[PDB]
Design a binder for this molecule. Structure first.
Ligand code: ZN
Ligand code: ZN
Lengths: 424, 435
């Protein structure tokens, strides 16, 4: 019977539904989960809204199961609701086309500002419960707004000696359910592994239900962690194999990421000329709407069509790129390298990379920085019990004589930067 | 990574030329089940993927009929045409698919007869004209004059003894592949059965591959039709059971259709104030963009957010309804009736129905008066297949329901609304509603 294709019919707590039936939350119906993936995989039409519901539901399943199996952990009806709301809201902060936006646009548009989508999820959440008087409703259901709002934000963004103020250290395991940076395993990934496979037509053999059934809390170096039964390791292999498959075959897809950087090139050439209306009446730009949640609420995938359909001559440059995509005259792939050693090209350095490439004296045609797009692309210690970064360059010039030239600058840049030699 | 239903499909270069086109790319922004998304989180698919599927499926079937029966003389040209027809049959869908030609246009412009297939045919003509596809068809063995006719025809049926001008009667079976109004079975339905189930989380047991493998053409009353092996009837039951399930459980979903009528109420209250730019510079309205394909190309699901995010005070009324939906203060369900054994409700009559309901004097005098503006009434509409035996091949072996909603949500008003409704059914001779 018609429900979520992955979790089926989920029924939620009235508090959870209050949070959902909200414009700050509904906002997620208009954010492609895999962003520019849609333009390469027809199946991938899902948005963060469904995903978010998934993670909320899954967060609850796990906490509630840990509770039943181990009453000694003293997991409360309150603790559960909090974890659910955290899973529910962890993605509130995603901007147009998901990771493309905090990952590439903002660092190109505003290199000085450190902005992450989780920061945004925390502001967006605060603004959500403020603009909808959710606080009186939390109190109604046994929540302590002061202590718990802290707890919720904390499990979304980490700490804002024992770092956290939302829960004591003896309930530390609750901080590994929605976001687990250490062991990679959280209910967040479980959901999006399941649906990215479901829409990409990829085999997914991980069984989170089985995993949840056999999960437990236990001491690991005098610290409480979520462990998995040893006889559950074959299921864990099946997960990581899926993670590796979604990555190798979809998230790193050659043309898929090319398109992503074109869409970003469109937004940039349009940033000056699109006004988003914020609090008070004040107007913001795409890149700057992150400064006010009133406006950010209205910054979704819509912005793409707003440019596409525009008639403004100021926006002709942007329109033309978005029109490149419909026709499929994409930027041309020039090659791939990765940094040897430890170093990762830092986000603040993105804006300058094309200036660098274009300045590389190779050992016919001259190319300028405007002709190069370079995008940086980034991404077994689990506990049991018994009963990196790759750089691709594209060229905006599509003629044979220019690509040969572009490859020449690229190979040299890798040379005098000490990145791995590209493959012919 | 490919289509989750057909996997990796590779298409003819002509097909790709048609696809890499703004008139076609338009379909990336039309929710397949329209207002279904706001009730089933899974249903985020658009007509673009669907269209590709039907294109691909149209080809599979034609090409298979061809190999099994060379005597039918099915050409490389005949195949390409059927593929393009399947590929373009949905070009004319407007914002939120069926919600638009089925309800908005009949409320917005009751005088005009508009169907989405008409629009698919104009949109297609405009597509191959705006992208110089015709020189490319000739390049691949197509006869633009004869074939463009053929394509349009299998999308909209005869544009006017043997009705069609695109193909002779001896290749009549080609006209039952993409759109089959008679027996219900076409590759169109097969695709959207498969993906509506795939996104709705519904079991779909029909196996179109098996069906395609055992399909054949054969004489049925001196007419060439596509028949199915008799031993394929259990697969056919599995199909119809899925059709009925997608209908009972999803396409007729109580709250799903309510939301659809609110979105329609929003577009209507916004129709005056949104301008769409067409050919020449001329400006059109939502309801009127169907008169010019330049503008229609730019009429997609975007129009929804354009209203939602709008700051215009003229558009405050519309905004408020779309905001009703985010908050989930929906119109309230009042009841269901059908016109069993009565004359059905024609599309031209939709605009007048609320005036009727509101004018129905109920038997007992009611503590509240309601006006037409307070009622939303929506009309909701929707085994003779031919078989053959291995032995002797080549020869063959509800309708409309009306629901009423109320825009007033207080208890004392709903009770009133139900009263008008029950009476309207009375003096209209529709079935008595269920308590
Ligand atoms: Zn997530
Ligand atoms: Zn269709």
């Amino acid at each position: 019977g018609p429900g979520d294709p992955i979790h089926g019919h989920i029924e939620l707590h009235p508090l959870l539904v209050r949070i959902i039936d909200t414009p700050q939350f509904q906002r997620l119906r208009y954010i492609k989960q895999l962003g520019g993936g849609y333009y390469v995989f027809p199946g991938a039409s899902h948005n963060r809204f469904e995903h978010s519901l998934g993670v909320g539901y899954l967060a609850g399943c796990l906490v509630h199961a840990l509770g039943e199996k181990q009453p000694e952990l003293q997991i409360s009806e309150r603790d559960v609701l909090c974890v659910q709301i955290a899973g529910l809201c962890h993605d509130l902060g995603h901007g147009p086309f998901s990771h493309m936006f905090d990952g590439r646009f903002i660092p190109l548009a505003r290199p000085e500002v450190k902005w992450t989508h989780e920061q945004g999820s925390v502001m967006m959440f605060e603004h959500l419960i403020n603009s909808n008087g959710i606080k009186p409703v939390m109190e109604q259901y046994g929540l302590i707004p002061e202590e718990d709002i802290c707890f919720i934000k904390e499990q979304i963004v980490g700490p804002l000696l024992w770092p956290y103020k939302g829960r004591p250290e003896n309930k530390s395991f609750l901080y590994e359910i929605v976001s687990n940076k250490r062991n990679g395993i959280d209910v967040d990934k479980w959901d999006y592994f399941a649906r990215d496979c479901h829409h990409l037509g990829i085999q997914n053999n991980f069984d989170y239900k089985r995993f949840i059934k056999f999960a437990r809390v236990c001491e690991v170096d005098n610290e409480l962690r979520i462990c998995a039964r040893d006889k559950e390791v074959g299921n864990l292999y099946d997960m990581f194999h899926t993670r590796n498959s979604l990555h190798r075959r979809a998230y790193q897809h050659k043309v898929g990421n090319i398109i992503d950087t074109m869409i970003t090139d469109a937004f940039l050439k349009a940033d000056d000329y699109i006004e988003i209306t914020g609090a008070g009446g004040k107007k913001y730009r795409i890149s700057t709407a992150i400064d006010d949640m009133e406006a950010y609420t209205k910054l979704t995938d819509n912005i793409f069509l707003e440019i596409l359909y525009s008639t403004d001559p100021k926006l002709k440059d942007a329109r033309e790129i978005l029109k490149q995509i419909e026709y499929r005259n994409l930027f041309k792939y020039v090659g791939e390298t990765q940094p040897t050693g430890q170093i990762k090209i830092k986000r603040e350095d993105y804006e300058s990379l094309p200036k660098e490439v274009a300045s590389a004296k190779p050992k016919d045609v001259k190319l300028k920085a405007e002709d190069f797009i370079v995008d940086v692309i980034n991404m077994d210690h689990v506990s049991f019990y018994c009963k990196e970064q790759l750089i691709r360059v594209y060229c905006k010039k599509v003629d044979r004589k220019s690509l040969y030239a572009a490859r020449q600058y690229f190979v040299q840049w890798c040379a005098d930067r000490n990145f791995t030699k590209p493959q012919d």
